Structure 1
Amino acid sequence: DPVQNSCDNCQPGTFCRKYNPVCKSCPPSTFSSIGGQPNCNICRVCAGYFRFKKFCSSTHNAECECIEGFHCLGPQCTRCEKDCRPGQELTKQGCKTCSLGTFNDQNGTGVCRPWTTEKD
């Protein structure tokens, strides 16, 4: 039934120009989760400290994760932080030293409790 000459009448994986509505498919390595935006967005590349979780498609961006020994920092994993050492735990703002009278004996995993910052 939707038949109108508009960029509102177009599907994800396309780009469309208001002045002359045509709904062209996204160029390679670009995406569009909403249809009829004037351009497709360039795909994120996950390299080095970052690895892929989700690969790029015409309708969704690639999503990163961090390689072993490192974890994501930021909403869209914009930075990698080294996994916590004993005497720390993973929180919002990343690896943080355990407080007064608290300790974590595990390296790179675990949450700390009160009963050095690494033992007893």
Structure 2
Amino acid sequence: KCPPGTYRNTWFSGQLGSPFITADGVPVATTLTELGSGCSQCPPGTYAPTFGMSVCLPCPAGTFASAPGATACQQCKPGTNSLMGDRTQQMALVVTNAANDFPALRAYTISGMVAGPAYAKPIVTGPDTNFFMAGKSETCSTNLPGYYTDVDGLPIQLPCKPGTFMPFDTATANLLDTGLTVDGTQCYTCQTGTFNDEFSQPVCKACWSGSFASKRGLPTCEIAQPGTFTNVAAAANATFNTATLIPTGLVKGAQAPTPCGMGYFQSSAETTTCTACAVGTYADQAGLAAC
């Protein structure tokens, strides 16, 4: 029988490994084998625990095997995850090699609101063409900004739950306290004056002026109750540039209720400005719902 870690098929020998290390993006006709038997070595991305088998089976999800002669697959690191291609390659929208078109796989397809005043449903358009987890013929790829991976073994990268946001890198962030660094594996809670009503969000949107938010990690904005107002200028959700699919320019809204001053009321909730009390009626204390 063939030794473990190798194989031999009558219909095909040889290894085609690492098709995302070469710049072109094509496999290599590897023919390495163990001398004594001559059985063909397992292609990078598979393994062979048993002694005798013809086809040696792909690496399962959440695992990897860079070396051809792999006895078994290793669980990806706590931070990173398993997904064909590297992060930048998965994050690349432009192409260089026209013929192969290899470094152009568009795996992100992020929901974020497009550059400019428009708001286009996911910026990258078209079917995801490169999606397999199992085939992993290289080091474990780092995690898409929206998602995260807590434990070592994880088939698919998990999205950050509502009221949380995992930025792309530590420096390329918007609102992070300067005593922490995003290593991927742990998802940081949204800062006061933000909302996040969906998963896999690389940064949570700042609440529109009317509604405000006080506590940390709030899945929805808190309604400005009648008797106050919320004025703020820089309260604009970040603008995902199409060049690198990264958000930027987020500024938080009003953290406090900031009640309506004396002689000034607000009957209607979810309001930015405060209305003056009419003639004949008075406002005795600040924060009065009505006159």
TM normalised by structure 1 equals: 0.42
**Which structure has the larger Rg over C-alpha atoms?**
2
Under a length normalisation based on structure 2, what TM-score does the superposition of the two structures give? 0.23
Query: Where is the strand percentage greater, Structure 1 or Structure 2?
Result: 1
